[PDB]
Amino acid sequence: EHVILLNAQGVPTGTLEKYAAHTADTRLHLAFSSWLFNAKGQLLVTRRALSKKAWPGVWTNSVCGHPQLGESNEDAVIRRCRYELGVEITPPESIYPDFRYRATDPSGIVENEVCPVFAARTTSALQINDDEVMDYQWCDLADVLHGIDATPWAFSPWMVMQATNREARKRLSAFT
């Protein structure tokens, strides 16, 4: 697996192996984030495995990943929902297309990404990949937003930035 390097404009200029790409000095690259809801309207929140290179052990939205060369953002979402969560989903819908951020995790590992955000509904049961996810919770979206607003430090910085974008929050609120 690789990540796709982006120039100042969002143009792909090459690739790097995925593990080697994320360092104290991570360069700008393409990613996605997704929020998954079940048929009941509950939000799936996940806790990243302790083996993840970046933000291990952190509570975050449902599934995040790195599209490969030639892959649509939506196909990447579907791919990592299968890979991390063993779950089938409805066609991903855009909720924050221009999100981009840079942040540094407690051990100094950086994420530096153009990261469009999506939402979808699960259409099967989860089957957890414990190399990716160490814990998870189905919850009411209102409660998760209350937690992000009171104690944002308890959640990943990109989950917070997404959830505190006024429009993204309105659009997420429609899946419940």
153 counts as binding a copy of itself under rule CB under 8 A: yes
Shorter beta-carbon distance to Mn ion: residue 105 or 111: 111
Residues 90-149 that bind a copy of itself (CB under 8 A): 106-107, 134-135, 137, 139, 143-144, 146-147
Q: Give the integer Cα–Cα distance in Å for 32 and 140.
A: 23
Q: Give the integer Cα–Cα distance in Å for 81 and 128.
A: 10
List 74, 81, 113, 115, catalytic entry: 113
Shorter beta-carbon distance to Mg ion: residue 58 or 64: 64
Residue of 151, 164, 173, 176 interacting with a copy of itself (CB under 8 A)? 151
Q: Give the integer Cα–Cα distance in Å for 62 and 16.
A: 25
67 counts as binding Mg ion under rule CB under 5 A: no
Here the tokens at position 92 are 């991903």
Question: Active-site residue 81, yes or no?
Answer: no
Shorter beta-carbon distance to Mn ion: residue 115 or 141: 115
Q: Are 5 and 28 in contact (CB under 8 A)?
A: yes
Question: Active-site residue 139, yes or no?
Answer: no
**E strand intervals along 18-72:** 29-30, 32-37, 43-48, 59-60, 63-65
Q: Give the integer Cα–Cα distance in Å for 163 and 57.
A: 20
Instruction: List residues with catalytic annotation.
Output: 64, 113
Binding site feature residues for Mn(2+): 22, 29, 66, 111, 113
**Site of interaction with Mg ion (CB under 5 A):** 64-65
